[PDB]
Amino acid sequence: VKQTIYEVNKYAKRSKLIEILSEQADGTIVFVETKRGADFLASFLSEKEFPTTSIHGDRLQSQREQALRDFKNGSMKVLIATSVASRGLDIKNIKHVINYDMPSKIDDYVHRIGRTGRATSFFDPEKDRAIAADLVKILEGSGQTVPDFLRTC
Amino acid sequence: VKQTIYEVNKYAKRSKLIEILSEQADGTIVFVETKRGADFLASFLSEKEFPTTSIHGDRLQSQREQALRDFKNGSMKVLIATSVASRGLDIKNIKHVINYDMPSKIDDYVHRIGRTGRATSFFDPEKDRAIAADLVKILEGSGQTVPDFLRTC
Amino acid sequence: YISVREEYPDIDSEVRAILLSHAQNGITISSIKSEYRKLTGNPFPLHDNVTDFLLTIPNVTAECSESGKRIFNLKASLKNGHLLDMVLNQKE
Amino acid sequence: YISVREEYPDIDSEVRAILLSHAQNGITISSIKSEYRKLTGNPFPLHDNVTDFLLTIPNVTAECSESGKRIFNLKASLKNGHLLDMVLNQKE
């Protein structure tokens, strides 16, 4: 899996995501930290003409399944899922995984990117410092370039 | 049927009606001219603690029947009906008929009298002048006192 | 609005009754004003900041419609719910 | 509001996305301001006349609850209807 890590401040993430989706959006899963963040982003992206659905912990099982079916059938080009509700998701062969919010555990990073291939992550230097060393090890293990900002943590 | 006619200006009618209902409200049918007038009055009276429903020409048949049922079963103390809709209503032994808006035809006045008994009517001298002479005849024929204002038209 | 409510003691019920009668499609401020004058014989007692006033009346709603019009309507209360239900389900 | 919409080009979408996420119970102005700052990093750009501003945004609704609180919410649009439906029917 081709992995790219960008250094992105918290409130610059939305613009960076839109820049990426504008290049190519189809079959993208975006992982975020909170349920409210997931619905906010799905609403915002949908208004920007990227049909986007969401999955999070407040959703009943039938609703999660429907959202997933919409993503699978093509009616929703983008799926936003929480860090937590991501662990149980059964979906693979994703075109693009985007970690809008970095996971707190490296096992989640490995699992998330195992769903695609192409994975892009936004590293917030004021939030994600603790996972940097583990991320470096995964990038190295995957034969991927390691950006300097990760090593300087 | 005890018939009482009050001379009441258009915008004095609502207060006069409330005075009357405050003495006794149960089993009252009130006839008004317009559909929105009927709904306005039913809303207003309900908020003043007289549970009031309405029947008019915009109501589907099932809705008319339900309103009539609520009046018959006691859950609605007052029923507001338009003058036009009144001519098809199948209901008698009403405690009190109130002509909030006087009918334009004396035959309608007579028909409503038959549905109750007390009947109270509001005569608006800027609207109901034409029916005065016929009303005098009906009052006299029914052994009722004729108020002098009906003779000066 | 204290002056308005002092002088027009039933204004909440009058407005709600107007909104209830128009609940199928809602109603604009200009139409509320004209309906108020027709029903009561008095001009609506506020000229401006009418949206804020209407939204001090329990159960009153406002919507910015996709058409661009600002439309006012009503939520059901215990006392008027039977009526609102009929209006919303009557002939279109 | 010309000044606001100039400086905050996505304010309509931002506000709608906040309201959508809170659609089960609606949300007060104070909470909209709080959520706005949390999600964008900027304070909400209006201090007064907020009700009037919010009601210039297509699909935004306001209600005077029986509790006395002024509560804002959203009508479904073609682009967000799928999300609004899920929020309204998700866990209580």
Decide if D1 contacts D48 (C-beta within 8 A): no
DSSP element (H, E) containing A10: none
Neighbours of chain C (3+ CB pairs under 8 A): B, D
User: Which residues contact residue A8 at a Cβ distance below 8 angstroms, ignoring those fewer than 6 apart?
Assistant: A16, A122, A123, A124
3-state helix, strand, coil in chain D (%, to 5): 45, 10, 40
Q: Do A47 and D18 touch (CB under 8 A)?
A: no
Phi then psi for residue A118, to 5 deg, are -150, 130
Q: Give the gap in angstroms from C-alpha D15 to the nearest C-alpha of chain A.
A: 9
- Residue D55's Cβ-side half-sphere holds a number of Cα atoms within 13 Å equal to 23
Distance, CA of A85 to CA of A63 (rounded, Å):
13
Quick check: B81 and B54 in contact, CB under 8 A? yes
**Closest Cα to residue B52, out of C49, C86, C92?**
C86
Q: How far apart are CA A65 and CA D22, in angstroms?
A: 22
A neighbours by CB contacts (3+ pairs under 8 Å): D
Closest partner CB to A47 (pick from D39, D80, D90): D80
Please choose, from the candidates D59, D38, D18, D41, the residue with its C-alpha nearest in 3D space to the C-alpha of residue A41: D18
D71 interfacial to chain C (CB closer than 8 Å): no
- Cα distance between residue B79 and residue A77, in whole Å: 55
Distance, in Å, from the CA atom of C26 to the CA atom of C73, rounded to the nearest integer, reads 5
Strand-pair partners of A28: A78, A96
* Amino acid at site A1: V
The β-bridge relationship of strands C60-64 and B118-123 is unpaired
**How far is the C-alpha of D10 from the C-alpha of D32, rounded, in Å?**
15
CB contact under 8 Å between D64 and C70, yes or no, is: no
- Give me the torsion for CA of C42, B58, C62, A63, rounded to 10°: 170
Structure-block tokens of residue A35: 């349920």
Name the helix (H) or strand (E) containing D14. helix D11-21
Domain residue spans of chain A = 1-153
SS3 A57: coil
Chain C partners of D58 at a C-beta cutoff of 8 Å?
64-66, 68
Select from C82, C85, C87, C92 the residue whose CB has the most chain B CBs within 10 Å, as the one to mutate to test that interface: C82
Q: D62 and C62 in contact by Cβ < 8 A?
A: yes
Residues of B in contact with C90 (CB under 8 A): 58-60, 63
- Residue C10: CATH number of its domain: 3.30.420.610
Can you point out the beta strands (E) in chain B?
2-7, 28-32, 52-55, 78-82, 96-99, 118-123
Q: Which residue in chain A is spatially nearest to D85 when comparing CA positions? A: A63
**Cβ of residue A33 closer than 8 Å to a chain D Cβ:** no
CA distance D42 to C75: 34
Q: Do the beta carbons of residue B77 and residue B26 sit within 8 Å? A: yes
Pairing mode, if any, of strands A2-7 and A118-123?
parallel
Q: Which two tokens stand for residue A110?
A: 């490995």
| CATH number for region B1-153 | 3.40.50.300
Question: Which among D60, D63, D65 is the nearest to C64, CB-wise?
Answer: D60
To the nearest whole angstrom, how far is the Cα of C74 from the nearest Cα of chain D?
Answer: 8
**Closest CA of chain B from C37, distance in Å:** 10
Could you tell me if D81 lies within 8 Å of chain C, comparing CB atoms? Answer: no
Is there contact between D and C if contact means ≥3 C-beta pairs under 8 Å?
Answer: yes
Residue D74 phi, psi (nearest 5): -145, 145
SS3 call for B140: helix
What residues of C are in contact with residue D61 (Cβ under 8 Å)? 61-64
Structure-token pair, residue A12? 């610059």
> What's the domain range around C24?
1-92
Q: How far is CA A18 from CA A29, B44, D19, D40, in A?
A: 13, 53, 21, 15
CB A98 within 8 A of CB A120: yes
Nearest by CB to residue D86, choosing from A10, A36, A59, is: A59
d(CA A151, CA C6): 71
Angle between helices C81-88 and C11-21 (to 10 degrees): 30
CB contact under 8 A, C86 and B67: yes
Cα dihedral sign, B31-B32-B34-B40: negative
**CA B27 from centroid of its chain's CA atoms:** 12
Rounded Cα distance, D90 and B52, in Å: 37
The structure tokens listed for B59 are 């109501």
Residue D48 to residues B15, C30, C90, D52, D54: CA-CA distances in angstroms?
40, 24, 40, 9, 11
Query: What are the structure tokens assigned to A21, written together?
Result: 């989706």
Residues 6+ apart with CB under 8 A from C4: C11, C45, C46, C53
DSSP letters of A104-135? SSHHHHHHHHTT--EEEEEE-TTT-GGGHHHH
Q: Helix, strand or coil for residue D79?
A: coil
Q: Do chains D and A touch (3 or more CB pairs under 8 A)?
A: yes
- Are C17 and C11 in contact, with CB atoms under 8 Å apart? no
Residues of C in contact with D65 (CB under 8 A): 58
Which residues of chain C make contact with B60, given a CB cutoff of 8 A?
A: 89-91
- Asked if C21 is an interface residue toward chain B (Cβ–Cβ < 8 A), one would say yes
Query: Which residue has tokens 């997933």?
Result: A68
Contact B42 C16 (CB under 8 A): no
Give the gap in angstroms from C-alpha D49 to the nearest C-alpha of chain A.
Answer: 24
The data reach a resolution, in angstroms, of 1.4
